[PDB]
Amino acid sequence: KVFGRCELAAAMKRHGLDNYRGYSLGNWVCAAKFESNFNTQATNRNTDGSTDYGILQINSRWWCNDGRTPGSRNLCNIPCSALLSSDITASVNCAKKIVSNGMNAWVAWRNRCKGTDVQAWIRGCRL
Ligand SMILES: *CCS(=O)(=O)[C@@H]1O[C@H](CO)[C@@H](O)[C@H](O)[C@H]1O
Ligand SMILES: *CCS(=O)(=O)[C@@H]1O[C@H](CO)[C@@H](O)[C@H](O)[C@H]1O
Ligand SMILES: *CCS(=O)(=O)[C@@H]1O[C@H](CO)[C@@H](O)[C@H](O)[C@H]1O
């Protein structure tokens, strides 16, 4: 499933991400846009042997368990397969745990969203 900008903003708001730990909804939508292009099925392999899963490109080494990653810590205590769903619940819940060093965890966010008017990503949407 590939979300539309406003469709994802609405879903993330419903899920309580707006202003979670001080991060406005726009930050999360922007992060999703550049991490996965709003694609819930996105999967990308990393050089260290981990994979990044789903809407938020959550990592197998630290966060989720795919059972194929040496040094797996599974800090979100969830199978990575749960992050490849049309239902963003698992990704949202894990994302909350990740930000609890803030959104710098997401390279794409730090590189492209941080410091910009991220509200532009939700402007025009009915929330
Ligand atoms: C992302 C699923 S939902 O139906 O949009 C959303 O899910 C959370 C968690 O189960 C609920 O608390 C929320 O009210 C729902 O809208
Ligand atoms: C899914 C949101 S939460 O973690 O259950 C909820 O988030 C708000 C901020 O948006 C916090 O103030 C609250 O304490 C949390 O439980
Ligand atoms: C928020 C993670 S958890 O599910 O509360 C916690 O996760 C660790 C790591 O996977 C587990 O060892 C622990 O038992 C879980 O409670």
Ligand SMILES: *CCS(=O)(=O)[C@@H]1O[C@H](CO)[C@@H](O)[C@H](O)[C@H]1O
């Ligand atoms: C978004 C709902 S949650 O994942 O269950 C949420 O997670 C935060 C951080 O782990 C908790 O502080 C909050 O109480 C939970 O509802």
